[PDB]
Design a protein around this ligand. Structure first.
Ligand SMILES: COc1cccc2c1CCC[C@@H]2CCCN1CCN(C2CCCCC2)CC1
Ligand SMILES: COc1cccc2c1CCC[C@@H]2CCCN1CCN(C2CCCCC2)CC1
Ligand SMILES: CCCCCCCC/C=C/CCCCCCCC(=O)OC[C@H](O)CO
Ligand SMILES: CCCCCCCC/C=C\CCCCCCCC(=O)OC[C@H](O)CO
Ligand SMILES: CCCCCCCC/C=C\CCCCCCCC(=O)OC[C@H](O)CO
Ligand SMILES: CCCCCCCC/C=C\CCCCCCCC(=O)OC[C@H](O)CO
Ligand SMILES: CCCCCCCC/C=C\CCCCCCCC(=O)OC[C@H](O)CO
Ligand SMILES: CCCCCCCC/C=C\CCCCCCCC(=O)OC[C@H](O)CO
Ligand SMILES: CCCCCCCC/C=C\CCCCCCCC(=O)OC[C@H](O)CO
Lengths: 165, 165
């Protein structure tokens, strides 16, 4: 049947494939004009921000907004190329690109996960009551961001040590 | 000499000088300043007052995480990378230097974006600590931009130089 290395490649292929609709229809609504999005998709983002209490994608600060422009200009073009590579197999030319993507993404989420778990989101802060208030509400939000840090770390370890790449 | 060997000399001097820069300056906002002598505390207070640095003294959550990354991840790599480019022809530094380059570049994209585009008034969360004029934003970007360009050169150097593949 399928192997261990090939199984991770299929799992990584769906990660890069599913990241395309997640970036376009969700994350980029904080940097791109609202008029590029239909009303049905603009309310879907608000369902997330209200339920998960996300203070970043709601109104992005300057540091978070710079990571979103990286996702549009650098990460988004790489997603289809990486998906095709790990679905086909034997594409060694992706080793250095996948390392660059992994290290970059992981470095974007260390300040994100640190802010969501340690920063203050009360009315006295600049977030002005928009954000997780309880420890359970912080992990409920960290749960959505943690797959985008763990999966790239898996890709970094895979690329550095795999002799077939 | 030559451009390649000269760049390795320049890179070695970058990683060697980054050791006193990190220990004696940048880590004063992550480590307790009781461990620093009065003179080293006063030199940082001079830089914060003269250059109007809004991040180094009282770092936000996102800026603190990078300073911890600079301590746990970057500082141990500085002597190894200095030896690799001073000696020359250390092909084992390629992937480790790529990881440092993409990490440090991703660290400063939000910093440069914040210094140039964010609001540093008395009503902002920085409480008038930052720079107001465009002139001092360049005075502050000038001390942060070499840590984006030199890692950018390193990334392009390791990706294409056949003497490290
Ligand atoms: C039926 O379930 C759903 C339906 C609709 C949406 C969602 C779910 C399930 C859970 C919540 C999601 C909404 C996704 C929002 N997140 C996208 C990734 N983003 C990161 C990417 C990396 C760079 C930093 C930002 C963080 C935000
Ligand atoms: C006699 O003049 C000097 C003497 C000593 C030092 C300096 C000067 C004058 C020029 C300024 C320097 C001090 C620079 C301080 N910066 C170092 C890099 N650091 C990191 C933060 C994390 C991301 C990477 C960059 C931010 C702070
Ligand atoms: C006293 C002040 C001291 C500091 C003063 C400021 C120094 C600015 C230096 C910039 C280096 C630029 C190097 C550019 C090298 C070529 C880039 C290139 O060709 O890039 C191709 C591209 O990356 C393919 O994707
Ligand atoms: C060899 C295959 C390489 C596949 C790359 C796909 C394009 C990725 C990003 C766009 C920007 C290009 C690079 C910008 C500097 C890093
Ligand atoms: C900004 C980056 C500046 C990097 C300076 C590198 C110096 C270098 O490569 O110098 C080549 C020269 O031909 C040696 O004589
Ligand atoms: C500077 C402070 C700490 C320096 C620590 C220097 C040692 C760091 C770990 C190391 O050298 O790791 C190499 C690796 O285990 C195999 O190539
Ligand atoms: C980390 C220490 C960096 C500086 C260490 C200098 C001596 C050194 O690297 O010695 C290794 C030896 O030469 C190998 O045969
Ligand atoms: C406090 C200094 C800590 C060590 C720095 C290593 C700098 C590089 C030393 C070895 C250079 C390579 C060489 O000369 O061989
Ligand atoms: C996301 C975290 C990334 C941090 C950048 C770390 C940059 C340095 C990474 C390598 C440090 C090190 O000790 O590498 C061991 C040795 O170089 C092997 O031969």
């Amino acid at each position: 049947t399928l192997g261990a290395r090939r199984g991770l490649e299929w799992f990584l292929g769906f990660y890069f494939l599913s990241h395309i609709p997640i970036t376009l229809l969700m994350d980029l609504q904080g940097v791109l004009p609202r008029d590029l999005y239909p009303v049905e998709l603009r309310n879907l983002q608000q369902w997330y921000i209200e339920e998960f209490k996300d203070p970043l994608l709601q109104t992005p600060p300057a540091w978070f907004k710079s990571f979103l422009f990286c996702e549009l200009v650098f990460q988004l073009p790489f997603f289809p190329i990486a998906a095709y590579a790990f679905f086909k197999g034997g594409c060694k030319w992706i080793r250095t690109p996948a390392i660059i993507y992994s290290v970059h993404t992981m470095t974007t989420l260390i300040p994100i996960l640190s802010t969501l778990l340690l920063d203050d989101f009360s009315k006295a802060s600049h977030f002005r009551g928009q954000g997780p208030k309880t420890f359970q509400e912080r992990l409920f939000l960290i749960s959505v961001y943690i797959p985008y840090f763990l999966i790239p770390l898996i890709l970094l370890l895979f690329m550095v040590r795999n002799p077939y790449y």
